[PDB]
Amino acid sequence: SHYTDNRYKMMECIKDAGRPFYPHKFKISMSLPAYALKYGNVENGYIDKDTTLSLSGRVTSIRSSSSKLIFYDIFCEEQKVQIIANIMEHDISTGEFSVSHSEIRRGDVVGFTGFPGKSKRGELSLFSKSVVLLSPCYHMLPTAIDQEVRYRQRYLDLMLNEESRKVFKLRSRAIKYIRNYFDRLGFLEVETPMLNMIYGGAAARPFITYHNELETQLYMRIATELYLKQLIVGGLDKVYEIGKVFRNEGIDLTHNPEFTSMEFYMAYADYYDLMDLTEELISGLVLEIHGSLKIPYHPDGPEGKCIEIDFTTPWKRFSFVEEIESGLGEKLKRPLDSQENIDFMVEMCEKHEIELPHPRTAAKLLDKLAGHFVETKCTNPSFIIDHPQTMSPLAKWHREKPEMTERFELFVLGKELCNAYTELNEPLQQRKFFEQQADAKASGDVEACPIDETFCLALEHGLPPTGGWGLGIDRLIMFLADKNNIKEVILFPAMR
Amino acid sequence: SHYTDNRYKMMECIKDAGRPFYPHKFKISMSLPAYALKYGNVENGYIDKDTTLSLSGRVTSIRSSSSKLIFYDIFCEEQKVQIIANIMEHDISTGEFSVSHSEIRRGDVVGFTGFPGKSKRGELSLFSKSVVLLSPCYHMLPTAIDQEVRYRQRYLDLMLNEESRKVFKLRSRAIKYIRNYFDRLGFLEVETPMLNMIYGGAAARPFITYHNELETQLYMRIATELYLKQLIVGGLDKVYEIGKVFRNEGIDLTHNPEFTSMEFYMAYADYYDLMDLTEELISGLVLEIHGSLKIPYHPDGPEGKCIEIDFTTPWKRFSFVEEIESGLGEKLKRPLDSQENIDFMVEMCEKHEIELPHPRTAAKLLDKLAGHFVETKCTNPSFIIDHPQTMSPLAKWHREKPEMTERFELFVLGKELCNAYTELNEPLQQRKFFEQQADAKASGDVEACPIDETFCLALEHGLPPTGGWGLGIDRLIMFLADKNNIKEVILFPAMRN
Ligand SMILES: N=[N+]=NCCOCCOCCOCCNC(=O)c1ccc(S(=O)(=O)Nc2cc(F)cc3c(=O)cc(C(=O)NCC4CCCCC4)oc23)cc1
Ligand SMILES: N=[N+]=NCCOCCOCCOCCNC(=O)c1ccc(S(=O)(=O)Nc2cc(F)cc3c(=O)cc(C(=O)NCC4CCCCC4)oc23)cc1
Ligand SMILES: N[C@@H](CCCC[NH3+])C(=O)O
Ligand SMILES: N[C@@H](CCCC[NH3+])C(=O)O
C-alpha cells in the first residue's frame, strides 16, 4: 500500500523538521462525554472565548469547506465532538494553518485546544486554535465494517462498530451482576489451578503441556469442579470461580476450545435448590438487561427472522430417559449400560439416522439420543433432568429413580448453558465410576478422564451434602446480546 | 490404615441395615453463625423446649462423659456450637441412643435436631434429640496442622487452620477492592486469550501446547499486554484484566510458574500518572486491611524476626542507571548497548562477584547490575525508574533522558510487585525493538520473545498516548497477609509427585 509507505515518509519528515513527533503526554481538560454534558445544551452559535480547553479523540471525518475553514469530527469514549478550525483563530507558533492541518488524516489520534460552544447550525463544537498529531493511522480506514477482519483485527471492529463495543460492555456488566449475586450470598471467589497433573470434571479432550521445573507433562483444566469440591471438604461452605477452561474440541458458531465457565459449590444444597437458584439468577439478569423476561433472538443473524425467548419461571422440565422414550415410541432396555441396551441404542440411532458416537459406550449413545430427541425441544430455557449415572460419574444417585442421578442441564435454543447436580460424596461409588470412566478412555473414549486419586482421598475426608453448578458465560452473552456466533462475544477468538 | 478399612466396613453395615446412608438433603434451621447471634446472649442454663432446630457442621470433638451423656463440638462457617446429647432426650425412632452415637467419629459431617440454649456453665449449646451421619471422615484427623501436607491436601489445612482460611478470604477481599477501584474509574474488565500462535509482553520461557482443530502448536500467554494494547487502539480507553499467566521458570518462595497478574491500560496516562495511581491504590488497600500504612512482615516465617514495611507516600524513587553507577563508583559506557559497555559490565560483574547472565546481552547485564546494586535497597515500596531502552522493548523513549524509557518497577522487600510504562506507540521503533529481541532469542536468550506482526499492524492503526501497568497479585497478597512463601497464597500450587 502506497498510503502506508507515504505515511511513514511524512512522519520521518515531521521528525526531521523538529515538528511534533508522538508527544508523550496530552493533558485533556475533560473527557468528550464530560464536554457534551457541560456544553451539549448551549444555544445555537454560543461561544465562550474566555475559556480555552484541550480535547482529544480519533478523527472520524475531515471536511475542508474552504482554504480558511476545516471541520473535524473526533470520537472518544462513545462521544462525537465537531472541531471547527478557522485560520483566523490559528496559533501560528504551532506552524502555518495549512502546514498544521496538512499533517492530519482520518483515523489519526489528535489533540485540539480551543473555545467551547455550538455552531450556528446547532452542532456541539470546539472552535480550535491548534491541532496536535498524537498518533497517526498509517492505513486507509473503511468508512464502516467482513466478520473475518472483525475477528482477526478486533481493534478495527471496536474502532468502527458501536454494536461490537456494546456486546463487550454487556459481557462485563453481566459478569459483574453475577459476582454481586454470589458475593451478597456470602460466597468466596477463588482461583484453582489451570495446569495440573490430572484433568477431569467434564467430557472433553485436554490440552497437554510440559513444565520445565516439575519435569513433567501437565494438562490444562477442562473444568474447575474437582478442585472447588475440595474447598467444600475444607469447610469454605460457598465458593465460586469464573475463568477459562480449555476443551481440545471443534471451532463453530457455539464452540471455542478456550472459553469462560463459572462454577459454584454450595454446602447443603441439592439439585432442586440449584434449579430454583438458576431460575432466580438468570431471570433476574435477563430482567436487569431487557426490562422483561421475553427477549429477542435472531437465530440466523440480523438479516434473518426474530423469535422471542421466554424466561418466565418456573421453566419446563424434561426427564432425560422418558423424553428419549417418547421420541422413540418405545423403552430403552434395562440396565441402561447393559450390552442389550447398547445394541438397542445403536439400532435406534441407525433407524432415526443419528450419527453414531465413537466409541459406542452407553453414555455416548444416550447423549446422541438426547441430542436428537430432547435438546431440540429446548427453545425457551428448559431443564433436562435425572441423567443416567452411566453418563454422570460425579453426580449423586437419584434418591427415587434407579440408575439415574440428581442432575440437570439448562438448554436455551437447543444449546447447553448450565450443568449441575447434587454432588456425589460417597467415595466407594465415586472410585468405581472413575474406574468405569478410565475403562471407557482405554477403549478409545477421547472424552473420558483418568482417575484422580487426590480427589478420592479428599472425598474420604468427608464432602458435606453439596450442590454444584456450571454456566457457560460466552453462551449466556450470546442470548443476552442476541449473537448467533460465539466469536461475537470473545474479544480475540483463535482463527485458522 | 486399619481405621480407613474399618470405616468402609461400618458404612457398608449401615447401608445393608437400611440405616441412614449419605442423606441427599439435610435442611438446617439456620447457620451456626445465625444460631450464635440468636442464642449467644441467653442466660446460663436457658433451654427452650418449645423450639426444635436442625443444625449441621463437622465434628471437632466427641467426649462421652458417661453412658448417658455425650458432648460434641461441631464447626461450620467459622462458628463452633456445643451439642449435648442426653439419652433421656433421644428419639428412639432413629435407633437406640448407643447405636445412633456409635456411628459418629471426630471429623464426620453430621446433622443434629434439638432444643436451643446454654449449658449451666454458659456454653452455647443444642440439647439434641437426634444425630444423622451426613458424610463420614475415613481418616483419623491430626489435632492441628507440615507445609507439604498443607499444600498437597489443602482441604486439611482449611479444615484445621483458621490462619489458612483467613489468607484466602483476605486474597478475595483484596481482588474485590482492586476491581472496585478500577470499575469506579470507568474501566472495562476484559478477557484476552491464554492460547495464541505467538507469545510476548514479558521476559520468560513459555508453556507450549497443541490445538487439535487448528492442527498447530500454540503458546500459553506470559502476559496480557499485547492484546490489551489492541483494545486501546480499538477506543475502549480504560481496560484491565486480572488472570493467570504461565512462565515456564523455577519454583521457589516468590515464584510459581502459574501465577495471577493484573494489567491495565489507560489512554492519555504517562508513567508519572501511573506512579501516583500505584501509590494511591496500594496505600489505600494496605490502609483498608491494616488500619495503618506500617505493617508487619516475617521474612523468615513466623518463628523468625518481625520487620515493618512502611507504605507511607511518597515512595522512594531510584533512577536505574544512576543508582548502578553509585554502586560501582563509576559510569557505565555509552551507548549502553555498545560492545564496549557489554565488556565493561562483564568486567564490573567479575569485580563485584555478580553471577553473569547467559547470553551476555546489554539488557541481561544491566538487569544483573540492578539486582545487585538497586533492588537490594528496596525494603519499603520503592520505584526503580527510567530503565534503558535496550531492556525495555515496549516502553516509550524517555522524553528527557537519552537511551532511557518512561518505565518503572515497584519493588517491596527486594521483590518485583509492579512493572509499568508510558507505552511505545511509534511502530517503526517498535518493529526494530522486536527484531533486536528476535536476534537475542536466536543468540540463546530463552527469555526473549518472537516478533509479533499482528501487534505491529495494530500500532500502525494508531495507539493513543497510553500508560500501562502490571501487578503480581500473589506477591501483593504475600505482603498483605504476611506470608514468605507464595504457596501460602495459592489454594492448590502444583507440587513434585
Ligand atoms: N476440521 N478439522 N481439523 C482437525 C481434525 O479434527 C479434530 C478435532 O475435532 C473437532 C470436532 O470435535 C467433535 C467432537 N466433539 C464435540 O462435539 C464436543 C462438543 C462439546 C463438548 S463440551 O465439553 O460439552 N462443551 C464445549 C466444548 C468446547 F470445545 C467448547 C465449548 C464452548 O465454547 C462453550 C461451551 C459451553 O458454554 N457449554 C456449557 C457448559 C455448562 C457447564 C459449565 C461448562 C460449560 O461448551 C463447549 C465436548 C465435545
Ligand atoms: N531443579 N530443577 N528442575 C529442572 C531444571 O530447572 C530448569 C528450570 O530453571 C528454573 C530456574 O529458573 C531461573 C531462570 N529464570 C528466572 O530466574 C526468572 C525469574 C523471574 C522471571 S519473571 O517472568 O520476571 N517473573 C516471574 C516468573 C515466574 F515463573 C513466576 C513469577 C511469580 O510467581 C510472580 C511474579 C511476580 O509477581 N512478578 C511481578 C510482575 C509485575 C508485572 C506484571 C507481571 C508480574 O513473577 C514471576 C523470569 C525468569
Ligand atoms: N464441571 C461441570 C460443571 C459442574 C457440574 C456440577 N458439579 C462441567 O464443566 O460441565
Ligand atoms: N506485561 C508486563 C506488565 C505491563 C508493563 C507495561 N505495559 C509484564 O508482564 O511485566
Residue numbers in the entry:
A (entry chain A): 45 to 189, 194 to 544
B (entry chain B): 45 to 189, 194 to 545
What does the paper say about this structure?
To increase throughput and reliability and to reduce compound to structure timelines, a chimeric protein based upon Cryptosporidium parvum KRS was considered. Visual inspection of the superimposed structures identified just three CpKRS residues that alter the shape and nature of the binding pocket relative to PfKRS; CpKRSPro272 equivalent to PfKRSThr307, CpKRSAsn293 equivalent to PfKRSVal328, and CpKRSAla309 equivalent to PfKRSSer344. Based on this information, Pro272, Asn293, and Ala309 in CpKRS were mutated to match the equivalent PfKRS residues. This hybrid protein rapidly produced crystals suitable for ligand soaking with high reproducibility and high diffraction quality. Cp/PfKRS crystals soaked with linker 1 yielded a high-resolution (1.9 Å) ligand-bound structure. Initial refinement of the structure indicated that the presence of the large PEG linker did not affect the binding of the chromone core of linker 1 in the ATP pocket, with the benzene sulfonamide and PEG linker extruding from the active site toward the protein surface. The chromone core and benzene sulfonamide are well defined in the electron density; however, the solvent-exposed terminal end of the PEG chain is less well defined. The chromone core maintains all anticipated interactions with the protein, with additional interactions formed between the benzene sulfonamide and Arg295 and Glu297. Interestingly, the PEG side chain only appears to show limited interaction with the PfKRS protein, indicating that most of the binding is driven through interactions between the chromone in the ATP binding site. Thus, the PEG-linked chromone represents an excellent tool for pulldown and competition studies to identify compounds that bind in the ATP site.
